[PDB]
């Protein structure tokens, strides 16, 4: 197991690789995380805002 999120309510819904060692995962808590597979580390946590079209603030 490479890593896991701190928040238990983060659900991983999609995954795509940028290169041989960089994995881009989308999450349910409005984030797109960019992990690094060899050491299992985290490059950057891209984020997205609320949805202002309806309720349910988490994109």
């Amino acid at each position: 197991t490479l890593t896991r999120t701190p928040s238990k309510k983060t659900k991983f819904v999609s995954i795509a690789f940028q290169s041989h060692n960089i994995v881009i995962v989308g999450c349910s808590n409005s984030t797109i995380c960019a992990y690094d597979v060899r050491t299992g580390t985290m490059l950057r946590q891209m984020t997205l805002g609320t949805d202002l079209t309806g309720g349910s603030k988490n994109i």
Partner: protein, 121 residues
């Protein structure tokens, strides 16, 4: 290296330093390596946060042994200066240890935070 329960996620690091600041205002905090070692040895310590930016890293490596003997969770944050001005010190604090009591919203936060540290381990 030797800092293997590293807290690298910035959301978890922000949660750790916010709980450190709240415990510092509650006076439920032991700052410094010697005071952290005393709290862990006496067994009053609920969670212990070391810092990985220590220039000789081997001056805080004795606390993982005492935490392995006393079964308290320890975690490494990246920056000791961030830990220091999270406690509210105006110095660089390399190890901090936040304690528990009978009934607190802070104690509930401590239990959830050591659950997140056990998720790191």
């Amino acid at each position: 290296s030797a800092a293997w329960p590293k807290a690298e996620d910035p959301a978890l690091v922000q949660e750790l330093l916010d709980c450190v600041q709240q415990a510092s205002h509650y006076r439920q905090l032991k700052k410094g390596a010697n005071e952290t070692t005393k709290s862990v040895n006496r067994g009053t310590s609920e969670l212990v946060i070391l810092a990985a930016d220590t220039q000789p890293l081997s001056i805080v490596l004795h606390i993982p042994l005492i935490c392995e003997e006393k079964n308290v969770p320890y975690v490494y944050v990246p920056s000791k200066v961030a830990l220091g001005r999270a406690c509210g010190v105006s110095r660089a604090v390399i190890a901090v240890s936040l304690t528990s009591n009978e009934a607190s919203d802070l104690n509930s936060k401590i239990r959830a935070l050591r659950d997140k540290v056990e998720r790191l381990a």
